[PDB]
PDB file of C-alpha atoms and ligand atoms in Angstrom:
ATOM      1  CA  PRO Z   1      -0.215   0.035  -0.084  1.00  0.00           C
ATOM      2  CA  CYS Z   2       0.926   3.873   0.324  1.00  0.00           C
ATOM      3  CA  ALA Z   3       2.038   4.926  -3.158  1.00  0.00           C
ATOM      4  CA  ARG Z   4       5.604   5.981  -3.603  1.00  0.00           C
ATOM      5  CA  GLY Z   5       5.898   9.770  -3.185  1.00  0.00           C
ATOM      6  CA  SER Z   6       3.071  10.273  -0.767  1.00  0.00           C
ATOM      7  CA  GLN Z   7       3.716  11.160   2.618  1.00  0.00           C
ATOM      8  CA  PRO Z   8       6.478  13.673   2.235  1.00  0.00           C
ATOM      9  CA  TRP Z   9       6.040  14.671   5.622  1.00  0.00           C
ATOM     10  CA  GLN Z  10       6.811  11.151   7.236  1.00  0.00           C
ATOM     11  CA  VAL Z  11       9.652  11.635   9.795  1.00  0.00           C
ATOM     12  CA  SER Z  12      11.464   8.475  11.786  1.00  0.00           C
ATOM     13  CA  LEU Z  13      12.743   9.547  15.021  1.00  0.00           C
ATOM     14  CA  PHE Z  14      15.948   7.560  16.395  1.00  0.00           C
ATOM     15  CA  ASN Z  15      17.280   7.600  19.787  1.00  0.00           C
ATOM     16  CA  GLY Z  16      21.047   6.457  19.709  1.00  0.00           C
ATOM     17  CA  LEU Z  17      21.043   3.954  16.615  1.00  0.00           C
ATOM     18  CA  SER Z  18      17.354   2.585  17.568  1.00  0.00           C
ATOM     19  CA  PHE Z  19      14.138   3.761  16.379  1.00  0.00           C
ATOM     20  CA  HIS Z  20      11.981   5.529  18.721  1.00  0.00           C
ATOM     21  CA  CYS Z  21       8.873   7.161  17.198  1.00  0.00           C
ATOM     22  CA  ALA Z  22       7.435   8.484  14.211  1.00  0.00           C
ATOM     23  CA  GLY Z  23       6.642  12.160  13.679  1.00  0.00           C
ATOM     24  CA  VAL Z  24       5.350  14.882  11.263  1.00  0.00           C
ATOM     25  CA  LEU Z  25       6.842  17.607   9.363  1.00  0.00           C
ATOM     26  CA  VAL Z  26       4.763  20.473  10.229  1.00  0.00           C
ATOM     27  CA  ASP Z  27       7.570  23.445   9.132  1.00  0.00           C
ATOM     28  CA  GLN Z  28      10.823  23.124   7.519  1.00  0.00           C
ATOM     29  CA  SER Z  29      12.396  23.128  11.012  1.00  0.00           C
ATOM     30  CA  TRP Z  30       9.919  21.444  13.157  1.00  0.00           C
ATOM     31  CA  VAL Z  31       8.480  17.960  13.593  1.00  0.00           C
ATOM     32  CA  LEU Z  32       5.525  17.149  15.792  1.00  0.00           C
ATOM     33  CA  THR Z  33       5.267  13.968  17.842  1.00  0.00           C
ATOM     34  CA  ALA Z  34       3.868  12.267  20.890  1.00  0.00           C
ATOM     35  CA  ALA Z  35       5.379  13.730  24.422  1.00  0.00           C
ATOM     36  CA  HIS Z  36       5.799   9.971  25.554  1.00  0.00           C
ATOM     37  CA  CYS Z  37       8.678   9.919  22.930  1.00  0.00           C
ATOM     38  CA  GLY Z  38      10.863  12.668  24.699  1.00  0.00           C
ATOM     39  CA  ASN Z  39      13.045  10.457  26.810  1.00  0.00           C
ATOM     40  CA  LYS Z  40      15.665  12.296  24.457  1.00  0.00           C
ATOM     41  CA  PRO Z  41      17.931  13.122  22.679  1.00  0.00           C
ATOM     42  CA  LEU Z  42      16.412  12.430  19.367  1.00  0.00           C
ATOM     43  CA  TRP Z  43      17.559  12.778  15.529  1.00  0.00           C
ATOM     44  CA  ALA Z  44      14.891  12.795  12.678  1.00  0.00           C
ATOM     45  CA  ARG Z  45      15.246  11.057   9.152  1.00  0.00           C
ATOM     46  CA  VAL Z  46      12.765  12.857   7.065  1.00  0.00           C
ATOM     47  CA  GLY Z  47      11.345  12.102   3.761  1.00  0.00           C
ATOM     48  CA  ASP Z  48       9.818   9.232   1.568  1.00  0.00           C
ATOM     49  CA  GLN Z  49      22.130   7.538   3.641  1.00  0.00           C
ATOM     50  CA  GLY Z  50      18.339   8.610   3.930  1.00  0.00           C
ATOM     51  CA  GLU Z  51      17.107  11.335   1.808  1.00  0.00           C
ATOM     52  CA  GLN Z  52      17.629  14.068   4.542  1.00  0.00           C
ATOM     53  CA  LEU Z  53      19.239  13.499   7.983  1.00  0.00           C
ATOM     54  CA  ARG Z  54      18.717  15.849  10.640  1.00  0.00           C
ATOM     55  CA  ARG Z  55      19.095  16.282  14.503  1.00  0.00           C
ATOM     56  CA  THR Z  56      16.934  17.996  17.222  1.00  0.00           C
ATOM     57  CA  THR Z  57      17.907  20.623  19.502  1.00  0.00           C
ATOM     58  CA  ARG Z  58      14.923  22.127  20.822  1.00  0.00           C
ATOM     59  CA  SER Z  59      12.400  19.865  22.370  1.00  0.00           C
ATOM     60  CA  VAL Z  60       9.231  21.550  23.710  1.00  0.00           C
ATOM     61  CA  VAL Z  61       6.891  19.275  25.265  1.00  0.00           C
ATOM     62  CA  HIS Z  62       3.144  20.380  25.841  1.00  0.00           C
ATOM     63  CA  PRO Z  63       2.895  22.358  29.370  1.00  0.00           C
ATOM     64  CA  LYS Z  64       0.089  20.391  30.278  1.00  0.00           C
ATOM     65  CA  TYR Z  65       1.603  16.968  29.476  1.00  0.00           C
ATOM     66  CA  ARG Z  66      -3.809   6.169  33.190  1.00  0.00           C
ATOM     67  CA  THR Z  67      -2.286   7.007  30.121  1.00  0.00           C
ATOM     68  CA  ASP Z  68      -0.208   9.883  28.989  1.00  0.00           C
ATOM     69  CA  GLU Z  69      -2.565  13.033  28.544  1.00  0.00           C
ATOM     70  CA  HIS Z  70      -1.705  15.988  26.067  1.00  0.00           C
ATOM     71  CA  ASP Z  71       1.404  14.153  24.927  1.00  0.00           C
ATOM     72  CA  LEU Z  72       2.515  16.404  22.129  1.00  0.00           C
ATOM     73  CA  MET Z  73       6.023  17.395  21.480  1.00  0.00           C
ATOM     74  CA  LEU Z  74       7.511  19.524  19.202  1.00  0.00           C
ATOM     75  CA  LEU Z  75      11.020  18.776  17.800  1.00  0.00           C
ATOM     76  CA  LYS Z  76      13.366  21.585  16.302  1.00  0.00           C
ATOM     77  CA  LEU Z  77      15.492  20.343  13.623  1.00  0.00           C
ATOM     78  CA  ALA Z  78      19.241  21.308  13.871  1.00  0.00           C
ATOM     79  CA  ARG Z  79      19.212  22.681  10.187  1.00  0.00           C
ATOM     80  CA  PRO Z  80      15.992  23.297   8.372  1.00  0.00           C
ATOM     81  CA  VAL Z  81      14.667  20.957   5.473  1.00  0.00           C
ATOM     82  CA  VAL Z  82      15.000  21.821   2.022  1.00  0.00           C
ATOM     83  CA  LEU Z  83      11.420  21.621   0.921  1.00  0.00           C
ATOM     84  CA  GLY Z  84      11.392  19.281  -2.138  1.00  0.00           C
ATOM     85  CA  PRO Z  85       8.760  17.168  -3.927  1.00  0.00           C
ATOM     86  CA  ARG Z  86      10.249  14.384  -1.802  1.00  0.00           C
ATOM     87  CA  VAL Z  87       9.791  16.270   1.507  1.00  0.00           C
ATOM     88  CA  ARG Z  88       7.269  18.973   2.361  1.00  0.00           C
ATOM     89  CA  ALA Z  89       5.417  20.082   5.548  1.00  0.00           C
ATOM     90  CA  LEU Z  90       2.116  18.705   6.332  1.00  0.00           C
ATOM     91  CA  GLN Z  91      -0.545  21.344   6.276  1.00  0.00           C
ATOM     92  CA  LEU Z  92      -1.807  21.796   9.963  1.00  0.00           C
ATOM     93  CA  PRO Z  93      -5.574  21.542  10.677  1.00  0.00           C
ATOM     94  CA  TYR Z  94      -7.672  24.619   9.815  1.00  0.00           C
ATOM     95  CA  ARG Z  95     -10.632  22.617  11.192  1.00  0.00           C
ATOM     96  CA  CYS Z  96     -11.493  19.624  13.227  1.00  0.00           C
ATOM     97  CA  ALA Z  97     -12.360  16.381  11.532  1.00  0.00           C
ATOM     98  CA  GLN Z  98     -15.743  15.033  12.356  1.00  0.00           C
ATOM     99  CA  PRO Z  99     -16.884  11.348  13.343  1.00  0.00           C
ATOM    100  CA  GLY Z 100     -17.439   9.533  10.171  1.00  0.00           C
ATOM    101  CA  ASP Z 101     -14.611  11.020   7.739  1.00  0.00           C
ATOM    102  CA  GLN Z 102     -12.406   8.779   6.260  1.00  0.00           C
ATOM    103  CA  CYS Z 103      -8.679   9.544   7.272  1.00  0.00           C
ATOM    104  CA  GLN Z 104      -5.377   7.827   6.657  1.00  0.00           C
ATOM    105  CA  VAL Z 105      -2.439   6.214   8.749  1.00  0.00           C
ATOM    106  CA  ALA Z 106       0.794   5.410   7.161  1.00  0.00           C
ATOM    107  CA  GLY Z 107       3.401   3.202   9.116  1.00  0.00           C
ATOM    108  CA  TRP Z 108       6.618   1.410   8.697  1.00  0.00           C
ATOM    109  CA  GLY Z 109       5.652  -1.645  10.897  1.00  0.00           C
ATOM    110  CA  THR Z 110       7.432  -1.013  14.055  1.00  0.00           C
ATOM    111  CA  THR Z 111       5.655  -2.385  16.970  1.00  0.00           C
ATOM    112  CA  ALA Z 112       5.843  -5.618  15.420  1.00  0.00           C
ATOM    113  CA  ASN Z 113      12.565  -3.946   5.570  1.00  0.00           C
ATOM    114  CA  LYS Z 114      11.128  -0.509   6.693  1.00  0.00           C
ATOM    115  CA  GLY Z 115       8.464   0.508   3.581  1.00  0.00           C
ATOM    116  CA  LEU Z 116       5.438   2.318   4.453  1.00  0.00           C
ATOM    117  CA  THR Z 117       1.741   0.952   4.413  1.00  0.00           C
ATOM    118  CA  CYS Z 118      -1.353   3.077   4.123  1.00  0.00           C
ATOM    119  CA  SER Z 119      -4.536   1.984   6.013  1.00  0.00           C
ATOM    120  CA  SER Z 120      -7.877   4.137   6.024  1.00  0.00           C
ATOM    121  CA  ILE Z 121      -9.462   4.823   8.974  1.00  0.00           C
ATOM    122  CA  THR Z 122     -12.521   6.163  10.271  1.00  0.00           C
ATOM    123  CA  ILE Z 123     -13.067   8.745  12.860  1.00  0.00           C
ATOM    124  CA  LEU Z 124     -15.229   7.440  15.991  1.00  0.00           C
ATOM    125  CA  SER Z 125     -16.907   9.573  18.109  1.00  0.00           C
ATOM    126  CA  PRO Z 126     -15.646  10.549  21.695  1.00  0.00           C
ATOM    127  CA  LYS Z 127     -18.478   8.200  23.099  1.00  0.00           C
ATOM    128  CA  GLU Z 128     -17.434   4.693  21.633  1.00  0.00           C
ATOM    129  CA  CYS Z 129     -14.133   4.757  22.829  1.00  0.00           C
ATOM    130  CA  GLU Z 130     -15.310   5.025  26.123  1.00  0.00           C
ATOM    131  CA  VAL Z 131     -16.817   1.839  25.202  1.00  0.00           C
ATOM    132  CA  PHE Z 132     -13.526   0.184  24.724  1.00  0.00           C
ATOM    133  CA  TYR Z 133     -11.637   2.334  27.541  1.00  0.00           C
ATOM    134  CA  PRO Z 134     -14.386   3.087  30.136  1.00  0.00           C
ATOM    135  CA  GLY Z 135     -12.666   5.744  32.166  1.00  0.00           C
ATOM    136  CA  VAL Z 136     -11.016   7.579  29.162  1.00  0.00           C
ATOM    137  CA  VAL Z 137     -11.227  11.428  28.976  1.00  0.00           C
ATOM    138  CA  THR Z 138     -11.672  12.141  25.331  1.00  0.00           C
ATOM    139  CA  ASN Z 139     -12.361  15.876  24.376  1.00  0.00           C
ATOM    140  CA  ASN Z 140      -8.957  16.769  23.038  1.00  0.00           C
ATOM    141  CA  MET Z 141      -8.581  13.224  21.702  1.00  0.00           C
ATOM    142  CA  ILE Z 142      -9.960  11.540  18.509  1.00  0.00           C
ATOM    143  CA  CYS Z 143     -10.493   7.774  18.431  1.00  0.00           C
ATOM    144  CA  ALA Z 144      -9.717   6.050  14.820  1.00  0.00           C
ATOM    145  CA  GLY Z 145     -11.130   3.087  13.714  1.00  0.00           C
ATOM    146  CA  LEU Z 146      -9.148   0.843  11.703  1.00  0.00           C
ATOM    147  CA  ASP Z 147     -11.050  -1.419   9.057  1.00  0.00           C
ATOM    148  CA  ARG Z 148     -11.368  -5.069  10.117  1.00  0.00           C
ATOM    149  CA  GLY Z 149      -8.799  -7.483   9.081  1.00  0.00           C
ATOM    150  CA  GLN Z 150      -6.022  -4.892   9.334  1.00  0.00           C
ATOM    151  CA  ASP Z 151      -3.134  -5.158  11.982  1.00  0.00           C
ATOM    152  CA  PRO Z 152      -3.234  -2.178  13.988  1.00  0.00           C
ATOM    153  CA  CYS Z 153       0.354  -2.758  14.817  1.00  0.00           C
ATOM    154  CA  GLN Z 154       1.623  -1.406  11.517  1.00  0.00           C
ATOM    155  CA  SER Z 155       1.532   2.177  12.815  1.00  0.00           C
ATOM    156  CA  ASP Z 156       4.459   3.307  14.846  1.00  0.00           C
ATOM    157  CA  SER Z 157       4.182   6.025  17.837  1.00  0.00           C
ATOM    158  CA  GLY Z 158       4.040   9.650  17.265  1.00  0.00           C
ATOM    159  CA  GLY Z 159       2.583   8.796  13.712  1.00  0.00           C
ATOM    160  CA  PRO Z 160       0.254  11.057  11.989  1.00  0.00           C
ATOM    161  CA  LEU Z 161      -3.396  10.594  11.135  1.00  0.00           C
ATOM    162  CA  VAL Z 162      -4.018  12.655   7.930  1.00  0.00           C
ATOM    163  CA  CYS Z 163      -7.655  13.598   6.722  1.00  0.00           C
ATOM    164  CA  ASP Z 164      -7.949  15.137   3.387  1.00  0.00           C
ATOM    165  CA  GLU Z 165      -4.132  15.876   3.618  1.00  0.00           C
ATOM    166  CA  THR Z 166      -4.522  17.647   6.732  1.00  0.00           C
ATOM    167  CA  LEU Z 167      -3.090  16.275   9.983  1.00  0.00           C
ATOM    168  CA  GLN Z 168      -5.715  15.718  12.507  1.00  0.00           C
ATOM    169  CA  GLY Z 169      -3.893  13.559  15.197  1.00  0.00           C
ATOM    170  CA  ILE Z 170      -0.725  12.102  16.565  1.00  0.00           C
ATOM    171  CA  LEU Z 171      -0.981   8.722  17.730  1.00  0.00           C
ATOM    172  CA  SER Z 172      -0.914   8.483  21.794  1.00  0.00           C
ATOM    173  CA  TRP Z 173      -1.975   4.902  22.433  1.00  0.00           C
ATOM    174  CA  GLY Z 174      -4.464   2.053  21.803  1.00  0.00           C
ATOM    175  CA  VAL Z 175      -2.340   0.202  19.164  1.00  0.00           C
ATOM    176  CA  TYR Z 176      -1.785  -3.135  21.391  1.00  0.00           C
ATOM    177  CA  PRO Z 177      -2.811  -5.838  21.281  1.00  0.00           C
ATOM    178  CA  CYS Z 178      -1.678  -6.771  18.046  1.00  0.00           C
ATOM    179  CA  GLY Z 179      -3.635  -8.975  15.712  1.00  0.00           C
ATOM    180  CA  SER Z 180      -7.195  -7.468  16.061  1.00  0.00           C
ATOM    181  CA  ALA Z 181      -8.784  -4.226  14.363  1.00  0.00           C
ATOM    182  CA  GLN Z 182     -11.507  -4.439  16.690  1.00  0.00           C
ATOM    183  CA  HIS Z 183     -10.247  -1.840  19.194  1.00  0.00           C
ATOM    184  CA  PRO Z 184      -9.393   1.821  17.923  1.00  0.00           C
ATOM    185  CA  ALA Z 185      -6.659   3.799  18.541  1.00  0.00           C
ATOM    186  CA  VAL Z 186      -6.272   7.012  20.421  1.00  0.00           C
ATOM    187  CA  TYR Z 187      -4.800  10.219  18.772  1.00  0.00           C
ATOM    188  CA  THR Z 188      -4.112  13.639  20.122  1.00  0.00           C
ATOM    189  CA  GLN Z 189      -6.683  15.930  18.350  1.00  0.00           C
ATOM    190  CA  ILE Z 190      -4.333  18.334  16.663  1.00  0.00           C
ATOM    191  CA  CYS Z 191      -7.173  21.196  15.812  1.00  0.00           C
ATOM    192  CA  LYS Z 192      -7.541  21.787  19.519  1.00  0.00           C
ATOM    193  CA  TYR Z 193      -3.532  22.563  20.072  1.00  0.00           C
ATOM    194  CA  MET Z 194      -3.019  25.084  17.209  1.00  0.00           C
ATOM    195  CA  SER Z 195      -2.476  28.057  19.516  1.00  0.00           C
ATOM    196  CA  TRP Z 196       0.227  26.302  21.131  1.00  0.00           C
ATOM    197  CA  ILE Z 197       1.895  24.959  17.891  1.00  0.00           C
ATOM    198  CA  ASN Z 198       1.752  27.862  16.323  1.00  0.00           C
ATOM    199  CA  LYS Z 199       3.569  29.652  19.029  1.00  0.00           C
ATOM    200  CA  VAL Z 200       6.575  27.575  19.785  1.00  0.00           C
ATOM    201  CA  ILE Z 201       7.036  26.971  15.777  1.00  0.00           C
ATOM    202  CA  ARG Z 202       7.006  31.061  15.987  1.00  0.00           C
ATOM    203  CA  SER Z 203       5.080  30.304  12.569  1.00  0.00           C
ATOM    204  CA  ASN Z 204       2.677  32.771  14.296  1.00  0.00           C
TER     205      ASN Z 204
HETATM  206 ZN1  LIG L 301       1.650   8.862  25.121  1.00  0.00          ZN
END
């Protein structure tokens, strides 16, 4: 799946020589990922050796960061990306995606060489995720239903949820157990964080 050249904003984050999290390129100098990936230090391979390698300097965890709540972290790249056909930022949400929308998640298969697979996903409502996770606070989350027969563990951690070539979410938890699509994952709802994201990026 996942046609070649799509997902130019896909980012793999490494600690040491080891894989850690995925992330999105939201600016030529900025990558966004889950705060729970902030063990640190990290470095970012961008684009879909490696097309462009960079490392991070500033790592801004959301101030408001049971599961991780408000887990969002902005990684600053040492040197800016050169925006190509190959590597581009992902447009940030100007709007919130509603339950029922068809979205997409691309993943390399960590949490189970390389290569990206695309799976379509259905926004569920912050209601029937309380069924799978009774006691969850949603409000700032979107639960993404994966279609049956799909292995949830093909996503990564920090990976993007794209809807209509917008970034609506960063994967927080809800991937395990592998082997069943029946449970939805839990993404940070990114259209609720725009005030903060634009402020640390200084992108206004
Ligand atoms: Zn987390």
